[PDB]
Amino acid sequence: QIVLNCGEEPSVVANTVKGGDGNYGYNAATEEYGNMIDMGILDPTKVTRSALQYAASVAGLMITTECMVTDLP
Amino acid sequence: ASKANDAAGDGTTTATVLAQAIITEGLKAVAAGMNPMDLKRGIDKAVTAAVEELKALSVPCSDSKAIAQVGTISA
Amino acid sequence: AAKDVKFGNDARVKMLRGVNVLADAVKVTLGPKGRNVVLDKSFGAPTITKDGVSVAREIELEDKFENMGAQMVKEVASKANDAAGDGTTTATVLAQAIITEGLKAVAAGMNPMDLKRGIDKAVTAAVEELKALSVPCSDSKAIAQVGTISANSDETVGKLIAEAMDKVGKEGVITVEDGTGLQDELDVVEGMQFDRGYLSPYFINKPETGAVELESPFILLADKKISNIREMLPVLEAVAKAGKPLLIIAEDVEGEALATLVVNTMRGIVKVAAVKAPGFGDRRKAMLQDIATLTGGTVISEEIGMELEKATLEDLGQAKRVVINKDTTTIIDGVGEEAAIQGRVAQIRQQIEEATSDYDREKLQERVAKLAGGVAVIKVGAATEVEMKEKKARVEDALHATRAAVEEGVVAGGGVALIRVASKLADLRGQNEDQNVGIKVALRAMEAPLRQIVLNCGEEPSVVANTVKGGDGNYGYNAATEEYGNMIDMGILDPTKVTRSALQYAASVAGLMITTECMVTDLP
Amino acid sequence: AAKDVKFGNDARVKMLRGVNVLADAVKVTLGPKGRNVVLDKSFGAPTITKDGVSVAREIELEDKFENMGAQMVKEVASKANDAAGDGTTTATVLAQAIITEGLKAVAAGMNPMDLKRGIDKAVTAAVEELKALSVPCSDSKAIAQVGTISANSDETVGKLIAEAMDKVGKEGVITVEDGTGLQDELDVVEGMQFDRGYLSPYFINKPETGAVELESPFILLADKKISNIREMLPVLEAVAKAGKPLLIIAEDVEGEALATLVVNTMRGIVKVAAVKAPGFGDRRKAMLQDIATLTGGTVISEEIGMELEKATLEDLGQAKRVVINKDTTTIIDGVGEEAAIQGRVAQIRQQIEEATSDYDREKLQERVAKLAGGVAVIKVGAATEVEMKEKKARVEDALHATRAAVEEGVVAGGGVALIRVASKLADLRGQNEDQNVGIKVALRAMEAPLRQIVLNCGEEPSVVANTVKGGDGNYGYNAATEEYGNMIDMGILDPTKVTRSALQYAASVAGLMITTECMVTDLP
């Protein structure tokens, strides 16, 4: 999504990042590849962890819905 | 998105994206004729393993520069 | 002529709706206990039938696009019948099952191209499983055995089929004629069959058959392409006064002469049919002559200087009967003198002596077979004319099954063979998850003909299918007797060739629809 | 009549919708794995084809204005095929891409005049890039190499193409005839080809071909314009009695005689065709005479005092075969005596001696080439008539590609060449920002045929495109085998001329639509 918002091929950048090891990644702001930590782009562990867990908890239940009931238009 | 905000106050946009990805692929799997309840368990088990991995990758942020970098990236 | 265009789901959904209507109406009559359908004649009393083919032929849909879906299935189903003699209804049933589940998969976001690929892989595996399942048919007992079964348990019909094949061989030429009296007759007479179709569909005087039957017709042999009606005139007029049908063999007939004959034949003064000569180039030269000797006719060659205008009846060959189908032409009981015919054979046998090439040896040998092998025919006798013609239809139905059975052997006919193969490759998997879905759709689709049979009978489709799955080989359920056992031994089977053709055609059309992204039609 | 008028966006939006319908239906069949389209013929069974040209011909839209957009694209696409032999579907694909993005740009508020200019600049740069990219095809090995590839990997087809060119020459005249036997025949016979189309489209007896084929017809040579049917009557009646087709060469034919011949030929007693004489003024005098000597016929000149009424069969030349297309006329195997024909050549060779002008020397030399060079022909042999006719179509398709290959060389045919050129001028810039946008639209549009191929195949268009971009030269992705490599070596290529023509025509129509501010049509 970050890459998509940058007007660049999301899959292309992902394949190159996947290819790399450790902290290697793409910097959207500078449009180039390098070590994410050296650059200064940091994600607190708590937000990263929480985002993944909250998204998954609701999503797992949501995909299992067979039938929904609601008021008429 | 709201729960993520409550937990840390940041990354809410990112959390929503993950929900989008999971839901779209999950529904597609349900369409395929797979049991939804099992798919949920697979997702949850993968999540539990992913969380542990994040903890191992996580390194302490103690210096002023590191703190400044997280604030700067957030803003 | 404004066009209405639909793409993606809008296009595919209409095809689905169209195919389902055709399929739903035709599937009810599939079983031995199958439900009957009533077709309404425009002016009079309605006709009721359990025959899927008649039902399918009749079906046309008001809604353009939906109509196309039904028609697309009908074309492919017709082809299966053309190459197997049976299974037209079965192919349609299989087509619906594959299409309905496959379409749901494409509209579900799964890749269509992969689904086709998965389905084809399952089909390919299924065909070989059928080959292992298949019980060979070679001996006279097997020929008669399949023939009597096809003949709806009539032992005598099977007997003539086996006897016919015994007299001229498996690949020989066998034809069926109306019986003069009560007794059934088997005769061998000089005659020839070759693979050449009819130039005009309009020529057919037997619409149920789709073939043209002529009584003791004059035969015109020509060495040149015919595009002008003028050459025909002196010979054409001569046949007209005589009052007998005329058959033409030449390089080809162009629209200038062909079109006039077509209009002339359809409710006109002189009704005639024409076909292309067998072989080509140097080979046609010898073969046309073989036909000439057989019918006692005279060949007309431009090379000689002989022309069609300069011709008479004495230059025309004769045979008691001739029949022309969509792609095959055969003649019965040529008038040519036995001395001439046998002598002609001697000339060909002498020709075989150079033996320059296996192909040339073979090709000459083939000529000997057609001219000397002869044509065996069957006359069908019965107490009443209705029974006689009805019995004749049954004989012909059995003959197609016997030839199909000879070529590939036989399999259980209760839909059981599809069941048996589907269970065998349940494990089979593909590279893509979408491909895996395609495999299940194809295998699941295979089950449907059995279930349809049971559904028609008023029995539980799921219950019977489960028990059939449990057993092995040809074991299965006979809907007519409500009994479980070896379907072949019991008396229910289909030729291996027909089962295969039905399944393959159904998969071909299904995959085809799955990959179709655009439809074009006129406005309503 | 009452007219419906739309301005600006209202006009352009309808053209966009119209073009998209035509484009969407035709683009699906572009790939080797291309998806098929089902067309309703009118009566009887449906027709299913992967042929974009067949689908394009059929499309007409209910909504006026939208219909015009489709038709505007169809005309230009047809022209590309006419001047290249292929790329009709490709041109349409490119046209949609340029038009859709270009129209969004004008709607957005950017200057339309500038967008056209930017697009044209990118197109012009791209054409040169194709010229550099293109691999030469001059030797027999290259001729045969391209011919077999086009012939769907059939080595024998390529061999005959090379051999034909080897005898008559690259610029010589090569024709294809149905084969009498299994063996393929290559023969050289006296004959002449010249550029002159048929006066009436109604004359065409081969609708798939778009050309008129005549068998051993009489040839009428005249020295005057013909407007009255009376002159024709004594010769006309004579040919009808003869039973052979009649071909007419003269200054021109007026509707009084032309219209009657057209009506007479369509479902009439005598079917004939006529074309205009080659050359003009003084030159035509010699040109008609050369044809006369070749055909063995007699020229009729008003100046002499000779008239058509006073002309007999003995005054008409003959050839075994003659064909006619939209703008070209050629004759095969003229009956004229070798002594007469060769002697005539000597007279012409003698004429060359004055050498008054390079133009006159050359013009006389050209006459020598046509009269003495002759026409080479190909007969196509096959096991069965369907295969023979099918194979013949393939041979003809290969020939067009081989001539185009010879004239401008070859490039990758997977849509790869457009990809390669688009990447090469990524940094090309225009004076105006709007012009820059036009440049991107054109370059981006180029990518689409590749993506369309991949989309049809069920593979990701974006993933395949990016990898293709990475490589250099003729490197690319083969959709049929799902493998990456040198497309030319692999076996996938298009003539340089066809790719160029498709791209240029697409740009021409696209720019044209962009600058159109008003549309006029009849009420519904």
Ligand SMILES: [Mg+2]
């Ligand atoms: Mg933030």
